[PDB]
Ligand SMILES: *[C@@]1(=O)C(=O)N([C][C]C2=[C][C]=[C][C]=[C]2)C2=[C][C]=[C][C]=C21
């Protein structure tokens with residue numbers, strides 16, 4: 001049975017951090033839903049790339065739960081995720097069911113906002129460290145990808161492939177991750 | 188004065204190879220136009236990500252010429268670029284004016300289709316090598332990025348950052364490329 005991924009897409013999301021995991025997960029045979037935070041309409045990402053979501057978050061939630069919930073970064077995208085009651089509910093449910101939560105760049109600051117995964121070892125973009133560490137609720141890592149149980153975090157656009165492949169390995173195993181990796185021409 | 192980039196977006200384009208250069212070029216202060224081959228409507232990329240172009244190619248051509256013309260890959264995207272008379276005209280004009288042409292993955296096979304840059308040293312995705320080399324009109328390279336004068340080629344999704352930064356360096360210089368690179372958290 002195919003694994004299912006929910007990618008939450010807010011205005012100001014970093015488009016590279018959105019597209020690389022969506023694409024790589026689809027290469028791995030994962031059923032991915034790109035879900036628009038604000039509804040069904042196109043989303044203007046941080047560098048003005050416009051992505052049309054597969055569905056509204058409201059609609060995608062009805063088809064839950066998911067094997068992974070993915071939070072892209074981008075400062076303004078993460079702030080929108082952080083402020084969302086819908087996101088809070090989704091992450092709480094996911095954590096409670098021991099499902100994977102994956103967040104990159106400023107994305108992990110939404111975990112702080114929603115009180116998710118406290119005590120975890122996490123990374124973020126270097127510029128997001130102070131925000132993430134406010135209160136000392138996590139332990140900070142400079143690893144490019146940090147997986148602490150079911151909280152999987154990463155640093156930036158340049159770690160997006162590693163982040164995506166870690167999700168793939170978590171859901172579908174090491175062999176599938178290696179097979180998906182080889183055609184990408186990664187270093 | 189700001190440099191200007193034309194990114195030609197066809198159905199079946201590899202979305203990572205489209206988004207990473209667009210984003211990175213915008214970070215470099217380049218004015219980027221994402222131009223829809225088929226018109227103004229949203230484009231379904233290879234892994235089903237849907238991108239809304241800034242304009243139709245027909246309209247973007249009127250605002251030419253550009254400091255770089257960028258051809259993403261994806262097998263079916265490159266085939267669409269290869270079959271396009273509009274693309275032929277754009278590339279011919281660009282080559283004739285000694286403007287930069289950048290192509291990644293299967294993207295460089297459009298240069299073959301349109302008889303652009305013959306004699307150049309080029310790379311492609313490993314799977315696209317035989318197509319690109321049909322007739323021996325180029326010399327083949329396994330470098331992750333190959334820049335031979337005004338023909339700049341690269342291999343795959345995993346070389347997209349390097350490809351994008353090479354464009355930036357070509358247009359805006361080494362210092363700007365280094366400054367844009369550092370926040371991306373690249374290895
Ligand atoms: C990344 O996509 C992201 O989310 N960044 C924001 C980091 C940040 C900056 C200032 C305050 C809080 C958080 C970021 C920055 C640069 C490159 C990528 C990304």
Ligand SMILES: *[C@@]1(=O)C(=O)N([C][C]C2=[C][C]=[C][C]=[C]2)C2=[C][C]=[C][C]=C21
Nearest residue numbers: 183201260261262292293312314315
């Ligand atoms: C890349 O984006 C691309 O264009 N690929 C197609 C390569 C190809 C395959 C078969 C025949 C001709 C060309 C490709 C393949 C795998 C990963 C990325 C890309």
Ligand SMILES: [Cl-]
Nearest residue numbers: 046074075076
């Ligand atoms: Cl940002």
Ligand SMILES: [Cl-]
Nearest residue numbers: 233261262263
């Ligand atoms: Cl493809």
